[PDB]
């Protein structure tokens, strides 16, 4: 368990993927040219997880960049760390998917997928012990959604014993008011249930609400939303990248977080929430569990926690952490399933992220995430009942029954969450 191969697909996937690499590069001392420029050897012990070390002592992201639209390309390279990526790892088509899952999964994307896997093979063969894969993408579009799930399928076929991990951005009318996004998202969730081991649900509805209502940003931009995504992505990968008491890896996270194969959709949270330019251990702890701090638009107090992983970053009393985490478990013991004993695990890292001296990251497998899938299901159903814009999909070869199967599978997922929400030890 060492190398993670990173894939970013579509506009959203490449956008939040680029910000991810900017953040962890800073945390690890890698500058935009690939040279190390830090002041601590802890920044380098586990650097091989995300970086290939080239000749010249130059560190290069093990990152593959994919999009059916060439436009996203020039945007990445012109970015701050745009030149740090392996130029050969850009695999970009000519015609976008037009927000059409079917074009991404079956036509445009299928023509380009073989070229993408050629690059995944190369990266994978250059690993000592490949942990698995980490994909960033949105579910509301056509490339990240349609071709992203196609890529997940092919990769699971070639590397069946490796962990598949995704950061999946869910659509919201509050951000992109394009009405086919529930189609694209339901068709993808259908794919993620079967082919991923762990999925971080990053909800644009939650990201907007945080910026708008909590941070008082009157008109959130994608940069505002992505500032919260990059912080969440850095927090949840901290223990893969920094050496701690635990030799954490993707499989150990999946084994202890996923009690049932299909329920692998995690609700991430982060404290403190901050704007792009701007705290005690008990404050950190209560905020971490606060619904206001969740990156999925669901209330955890409307469900039950199956498993929880917390990550504290900064210089702070580990014992104070231990006593706050125990406190939150006993006062609110009704929200943690009693049939999974000791289902909350804590880790503390000494290195905090940029701009903050103390921070806490939350990763919950809560039954409350069914509120997210229900919201998408209701929008899917409202559109599907009136058959709006379906020829765009069947015109690319899909069957109407592919829509009913996806909707049926997503509603089954909801029912499974509700089943374990009401289950008792008795």
């Amino acid at each position: 368990m060492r190398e993670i191969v990173h894939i970013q697909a579509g506009q959203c996937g490449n956008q939040i993927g680029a910000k991810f690499w900017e953040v962890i590069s800073d945390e690890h001392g890698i500058d935009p040219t690939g040279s190390y420029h830090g002041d601590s050897d802890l920044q380098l012990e586990r650097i091989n997880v995300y970086y290939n070390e080239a000749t010249g002592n130059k560190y290069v992201p093990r990152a593959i960049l994919v999009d059916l639209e060439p436009g996203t390309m020039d945007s990445v390279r012109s970015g701050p760390f745009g030149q740090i990526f392996r130029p050969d790892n850009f695999v970009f088509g000519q015609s976008g998917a037009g927000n059409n899952w079917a074009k991404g999964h079956y036509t445009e994307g299928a023509e380009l997928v073989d070229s993408v896997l050629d690059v995944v093979r190369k990266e994978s063969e250059s690993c000592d012990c490949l942990q698995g894969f980490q994909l960033t993408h949105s579910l509301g579009g056509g490339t990240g959604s349609g071709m992203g799930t196609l890529l997940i399928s092919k990769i699971r076929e070639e590397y069946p014993d490796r962990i598949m991990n995704t950061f999946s951005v869910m659509p919201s009318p509050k951000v992109s008011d394009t009405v086919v996004e529930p189609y694209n998202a339901t068709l993808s969730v259908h794919q993620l249930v079967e082919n991923t081991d762990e999925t971080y649900c990053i909800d644009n509805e939650a990201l907007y609400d945080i910026c708008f209502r909590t941070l008082k940003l009157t008109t959130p931009t994608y940069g505002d939303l992505n500032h919260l995504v990059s912080a969440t992505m850095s927090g949840v990968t901290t223990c893969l990248r920094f050496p701690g008491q635990l030799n954490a890896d993707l499989r150990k996270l999946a084994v202890n977080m996923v009690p049932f194969p299909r329920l692998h959709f995690f609700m991430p949270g982060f404290a403190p929430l901050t704007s792009r330019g701007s705290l005690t251990v008990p404050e950190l702890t209560q905020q971490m569990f606060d619904s206001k701090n969740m990156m999925a638009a669901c209330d955890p107090r409307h469900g039950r926690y199956l498993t929880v992983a917390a990550i504290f970053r900064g210089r702070m009393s580990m014992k104070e952490v231990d006593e706050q985490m125990l406190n939150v478990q006993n006062k609110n013991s009704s929200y943690f399933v009693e049939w999974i004993p000791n289902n909350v695990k804590t880790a503390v890292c000494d290195i905090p992220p940029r701009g903050l001296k103390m921070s806490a990251t939350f990763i919950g497998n809560s039954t409350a995430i069914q509120e997210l899938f229900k919201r998408i299901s209701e929008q899917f159903t409202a559109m599907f009942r009136r058959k709006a814009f379906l020829h765009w999909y069947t015109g690319e070869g899909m069957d109407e029954m592919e829509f009913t199967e996806a909707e049926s599978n997503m509603n089954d997922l909801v029912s499974e969450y509700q089943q374990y929400q009401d289950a008792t030890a008795d």
């Binding site: 008491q245 635990l246 890896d249 084994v255 498993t307 580990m318 231990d322 004993p341 000791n342 030890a425």
Partner: protein
């Protein structure tokens, strides 16, 4: 002399093994490079410490020890640490991919990739022995390697060494220091599959060691190093009879004779006293009676349980230091007039006593004060069943919902082995209730 081979499996096994062999070397006067001046027989010998150390011709004394892990991080520290020159380099064995807290990976899939190399390296050590008595196996219950690979290893050792004794030092999980939610599963799985292949197993409850470090040693948040140094002092007290002269537990077979009346109920409870903080170097030196009485206080136990709710079937007291036999006998006489100490009606009610007159050793960097006399009591009490019950209950809560079971079924294990292991634990508990 008759050789003993120690085997350390997984992180907990390896790290505790480091602490133990550090202590052993100090106790025997061996330097981190293997040199031992007090040895006059250079090139080999039949001294009592030769049970645990082979001897090269250059004065090098080499542990009869093997360290195994499915990931290299932990063992890599042994290879680059103070004792990088002490052990057989080929007896530090690492894979590249660990068991991911999954018994099935450690036993069926990942573990199968390295098992034959481990056995061939063990046979190498065994071949340098003139009279191998058996093996001491160190491992955690909750880890995927400690649980699954240990069970696979013990199975293969039984077939390849049918006549040799096998002793276990097993780390029983505690939520305070726990790493995985599935540790109850792994603990019951390894216990079921190892029961028939182990002759005597000393469980170490991490919670009990945790509490001792906090209460006795005034350590706010104990680390693994704190726990392991305290555990090593208890292991050393249990294995001292094998490495020194003495009349009690002089070989592995006698451990069963004195502590294990029946094969399946082979889980003795260890109690150690006195545990005193090194910051109190000018403590009142406790008498034999005082340290003997402390072995019946639950606070000094290595497994959390109430021996007053149970019955004793065997009791062995192992003293170290300035201990006069007559004072031991007087202290035992007192104990026998305590009605909280109840023996079963079919065992000799007496106590077995060994005394090593060398004062206990404390490691530099340790948290224990040096003392003039210490004692480790090894008893087989039905109260240890309470620790199995705690594990069985956590197991039952999760298995009732089949939580996490797919992780095991997907790594080469049948779902029925869960119920088979749980029923075996059910039978073990009735075994204890019947003697009680």
């Amino acid at each position: 002399m008759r050789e003993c081979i120690s085997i350390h499996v997984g992180q907990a096994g390896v790290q505790i093994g480091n602490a133990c062999w550090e202590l052993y070397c100090l106790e025997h006067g061996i330097q981190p490079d293997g040199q031992m001046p007090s040895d006059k027989t250079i090139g080999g010998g039949d001294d009592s410490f030769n049970t645990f150390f082979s001897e090269t011709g250059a004065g090098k004394h080499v542990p009869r020890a093997v360290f195994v892990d499915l990931e290299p991080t932990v063992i890599d520290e042994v290879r680059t640490g103070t004792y990088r020159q002490l052990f057989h380099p080929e007896q530090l064995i690492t894979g590249k991919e660990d068991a991911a807290n999954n018994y099935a990976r450690g036993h069926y899939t990942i573990g199968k990739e390295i098992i034959d190399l481990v056995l061939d390296r063990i046979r190498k050590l065994a071949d340098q022995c003139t009279g191998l008595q058996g093996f001491l196996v160190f491992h955690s219950f909750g880890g995927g390697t400690g649980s699954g690979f240990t069970s696979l290893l013990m199975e293969r050792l039984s077939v390849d060494y049918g006549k040799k004794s096998k002793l276990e030092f097993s780390i029983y999980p505690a939520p305070q220091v726990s790493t995985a939610v599935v540790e109850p599963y792994n603990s019951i799985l390894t216990t079921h599959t190892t029961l028939e292949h182990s002759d005597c197993a000393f469980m170490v409850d991490n919670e009990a060691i945790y509490d001792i470090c906090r209460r006795n040693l005034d350590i706010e948040r104990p680390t693994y190093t704190n726990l392991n140094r305290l555990i090593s002092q208890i292991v050393s007290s249990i294995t001292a009879s094998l490495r020194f002269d003495g009349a009690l537990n002089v070989d592995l077979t006698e451990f069963q004779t004195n502590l294990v009346p029946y094969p399946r109920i082979h889980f003795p409870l260890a109690t150690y006293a006195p545990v005193i903080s090194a910051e109190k170097a000018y403590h009142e030196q406790l008498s034999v009676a005082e340290i003997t009485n402390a072995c019946f206080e639950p606070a000094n136990q290595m497994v959390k349980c109430d021996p007053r709710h149970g019955k004793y079937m065997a009791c062995c007291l192992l003293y170290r230091g300035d201990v006069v036999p007559k004072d031991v006998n007087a202290a035992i006489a007192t104990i026998k007039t305590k009605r909280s100490i109840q023996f079963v009606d079919w065992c000799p009610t007496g106590f077995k006593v060994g005394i090593n007159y060398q004062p206990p050793t404390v490691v530099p960097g340790g948290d224990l004060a040096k003392v003039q006399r210490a004692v480790c009591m090894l008893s087989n009490t039905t109260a240890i069943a309470e620790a199995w019950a705690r594990l069985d209950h956590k197991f039952d809560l999760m298995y009732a919902k089949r939580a996490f079971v797919h992780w095991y079924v997907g790594e080469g294990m049948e779902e029925g082995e869960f119920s088979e292991a749980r029923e075996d634990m059910a039978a073990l508990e009735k075994d204890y209730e019947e003697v009680g």
